[PDB]
Amino acid sequence: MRDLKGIFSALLVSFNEDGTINEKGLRQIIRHNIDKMKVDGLYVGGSTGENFMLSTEEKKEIFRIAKDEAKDQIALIAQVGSVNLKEAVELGKYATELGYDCLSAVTPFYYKFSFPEIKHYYDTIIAETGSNMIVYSIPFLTGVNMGIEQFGELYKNPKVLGVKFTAGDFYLLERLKKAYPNHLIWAGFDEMMLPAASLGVDGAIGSTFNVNGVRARQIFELTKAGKLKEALEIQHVTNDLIEGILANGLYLTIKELLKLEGVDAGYCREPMTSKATAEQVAKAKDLKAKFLS
Amino acid sequence: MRDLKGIFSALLVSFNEDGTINEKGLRQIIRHNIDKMKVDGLYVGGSTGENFMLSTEEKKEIFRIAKDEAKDQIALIAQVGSVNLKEAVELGKYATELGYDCLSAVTPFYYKFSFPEIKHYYDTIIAETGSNMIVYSIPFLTGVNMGIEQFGELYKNPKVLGVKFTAGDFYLLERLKKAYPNHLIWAGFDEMMLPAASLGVDGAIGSTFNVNGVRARQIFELTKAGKLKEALEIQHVTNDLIEGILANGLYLTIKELLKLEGVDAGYCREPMTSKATAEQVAKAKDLKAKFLS
Amino acid sequence: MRDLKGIFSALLVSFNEDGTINEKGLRQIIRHNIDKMKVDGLYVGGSTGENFMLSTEEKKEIFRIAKDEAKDQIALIAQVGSVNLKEAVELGKYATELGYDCLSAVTPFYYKFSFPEIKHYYDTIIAETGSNMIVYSIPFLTGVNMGIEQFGELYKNPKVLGVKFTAGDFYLLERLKKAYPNHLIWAGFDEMMLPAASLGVDGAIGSTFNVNGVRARQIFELTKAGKLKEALEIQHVTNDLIEGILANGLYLTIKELLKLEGVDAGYCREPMTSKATAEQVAKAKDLKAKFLS
Amino acid sequence: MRDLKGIFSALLVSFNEDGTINEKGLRQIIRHNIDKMKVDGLYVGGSTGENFMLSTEEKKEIFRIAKDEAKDQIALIAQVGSVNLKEAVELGKYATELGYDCLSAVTPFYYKFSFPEIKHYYDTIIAETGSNMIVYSIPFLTGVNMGIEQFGELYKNPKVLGVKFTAGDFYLLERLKKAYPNHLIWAGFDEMMLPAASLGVDGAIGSTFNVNGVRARQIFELTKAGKLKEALEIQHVTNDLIEGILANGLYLTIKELLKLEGVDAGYCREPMTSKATAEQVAKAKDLKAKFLS
């Protein structure tokens, strides 16, 4: 089976000014991740891809383009979670039919679902698609917080391979590895890669890897090698780029940085501000010149 | 044009065991609201409706069935908000074409949208539909808390009539009324109806009105006439049933209570637990005898 | 036991520039509350008195001075709560010896105490002093939320008379009046008096009553009589005043307003900013011109 | 001026049944830390010492006792923070008069103090004593969170040496080390020692070091040498011990663990539960058997 460890970019999507997918531009983002960032894989349809603002047909279109463009050069994970469990099932089947290596699904949100509800939801996607699953935690956006016992119950399904941990609880992180050493863990906070890698994470799924893949791989590998002083430096420079990107607007700044690489990363999708201001464009141009040139 | 003040039930939906809509059962729920609960109107497609777990096609069907069953008997408000602004526009246009009296929209959620992205979302839905808009505030599910200055900005659009205040900040409630005396406020917490009415709210949109509609109108109408003592006792009795409903599980219990009336309110839609256990059914029946017989 | 229902000012204390107690100014604040604000009682040693920034001796001094000036002209409640239980027993005993009518105590804070620890704390102050107790709930400062079952445990001690409800949950508020109809509730949020009174609170303990006691009384009295329109208008003006007080600096503005009545309300105690800026003093004078002249 | 890097046990205090200090047992906790735990220092008067439950004189006695027992064998840091700045200055001078190597002070709590108020409070303690200061950050108890720009203001006083980072934000800890590379950082969460040491903290101040000081030093030193796999193994076993401790009652379990080494660690001080139950006593025994034998 395909190896899911390593560096995964959470794929960003190029949109036209009217909010439609810019396929050509999406293809240039995938090619940049594979050829330049040298990621081990892509995590498609996640929050970074502006996924929760799209229709079911557009999600399928994004899955088709990413698999068509990446082919078998890298690993591919498909994020198909939704508040609509039938939608999640139908997406999961589609990505399974396309050949994605594994599914992933955000905790169902909005409503306050009980834990048994959350487990039934994972079990149903798995059962209905026949594919392996990566639980996707992102407490800051869903408000859902899972504890060690709850990961154990999800892990009773043997097709659940592990978790995309976009959480800053390093105590929980450590406990997960202690209690389920065979389950994988992908760090989801790019600004906390080093500390996460010192606790044995198996890889990382990140939005800033779209532009900072080289450094990200460097932190990861240097940490895994015990080369902590060197890793910290690169995390320091990374975190200065990250800090500028968060202050200037995450999605637009990563898109403007890609444009400066000649990738037609296009606009954001509304209700997110679709166009950068002059100030955002000048600031990206300064981030490029300081950290990515 | 039609008056939107008064008592609106937040319409629950009947589902079949496989998740599909039970059109006959749904029709019965509407008929129960109109004929026995004597609501002034229905609020269709809100959270109570299990709306964010469905496809756009299923939300359109629910809107077609309510309009066709209720006719012009009562006021109809169509909640069409979503993380997908294109979907909000499409639903918005469909509800406007169906003849609903007004639209409503939840603040866009999941992503941390800025205020102006939120305002631009409301202005876009109005601009594509030409209908009046009710801002739907539900901080406990969204994580979005707007303040007086933000409500004023939203209220620059004249199509914005007011807000479904599903919040318990009674200082803010008072300030909205003092600041925008001509804008409407619907109370959203059924168990807090009297305190909200004492500050001048113009009506209430609630899920417990599907079964406790006679009592809700009395708290409201007695509070408005200053008969606070009588009002409080009815709110006392009402809160006993609400505490019962909440402890037994809100969606299923209101549906089971609907069944006890002769209404095929059905199952809940998955990822919510679709079937009531035997304990849940028994408790529904005790709530029936005690409070609604 | 003297009647404790009605309007109570949470007493502010006057401090000299060096942080010591200005006895003379303290007497003038007390005289202003009894004579001009026409309060039913004083709640001495609370949050508003700047109590938690003071030594055990200074707390005793304030209880001496308040009892000497008020004598038996009004009811006196003594807030003796602390993270230190020996200190709360010591203060409770001194205030009981001076003749305070009732004791009050904030839930022990800082550390996360269990509910049995909180209950043992109240029972210990009561058993050591022999006085009646008002449970002082203030979630915004303490982080402690208690429910109906816990209040019932607290109410197994018959010397606990009820709760200073400084919290915004109007559902919990209703439930408490319903479950424990003979226990008293004093509202703690001045800007939500009206809705609290509609739920049958028995009185109110508030910091703004040191300057706005005339209106405070009217809202409570008009609300309990069913004269809601009059009440609501007086709540609307009170809330304009309170919004300006809150925006200008709660503690300093009230003392600045007191000084415009000829009361030497003095400075705030450090770590709190001790002197009003020229802008704060100017805003106080505007508030006084518009709402208190 | 003496070196403050390294492993610091947040000293636990031995109380008698009646809550008074048991000086003999306090001396044995000190000799165990210095002689068997091999710490570099003690952090006296922190939360772990049950400090905010005591009187000023009792705070002074513990300062007197620990200095007198430790002498100049190890570094000593005196936590003197309080909501009473006057007390904080008085304890600060006393600790300075006894020869403590540095002071430390929790951000004033309970009231919602402003940043400039927080800064003025540390600058006053520094000015009145002439001692250096370690800013004590514990957001989960105080609710005070401070950012990069706030540390920068605090760091404008040269006598501020750094921070007792009792927080889980690893992005903020990376940014702190990047922005103020010469200011010290001590990790406050024992169970997150390793990831904290991977980001370059200069030492750790911890309550579990009273009994697990040998492993705590190994994790630190191993991580600083980039021996991540051994570090992790030892963090894992440490975290099973801490998990059991947290689950049984942190305060009573460390004392019971102490008593199983023949240290008379005594009772907790009330309002905390003073006596361990038979179940808490049997589980400490199991914890000693599995991890400290």
From Swiss-Prot, chains A, B, C, D:
Its main location: cytoplasm. Its EC number is 4.1.3.3. One of its GO terms (cellular component) is cytosol. PROSITE patterns: DHDPS_1, DHDPS_2. It is found in: Cytoplasm. The active site is at 136 (proton donor), 164 (schiff-base intermediate with substrate). Pathway: Amino-sugar metabolism; N-acetylneuraminate degradation; D-fructose 6-phosphate from N-acetylneuraminate: step 1/5. The keyword Hydrolase does not apply. It comes from the Bacteria. It catalyses: aceneuramate = aldehydo-N-acetyl-D-mannosamine + pyruvate. The keyword Plastid does not apply. It is an enzyme of class 4 (lyase). Gene3D superfamilies: Aldolase class I (3.20.20.70). Aceneuramate binds at residues 47-48, 166, 188, 190-191, 207. CDD domains: NAL. Homotetramer. Catalyzes the reversible aldol cleavage of N-acetylneuraminic acid (sialic acid; Neu5Ac) to form pyruvate and N-acetylmannosamine (ManNAc) via a Schiff base intermediate. NCBIfam families: nanA (TIGR00683), PRK04147.1 (NF003164). Belongs to the DapA family. NanA subfamily. This is N-acetylneuraminate lyase. It comes from Haemophilus influenzae (strain ATCC 51907 / DSM 11121 / KW20 / Rd).
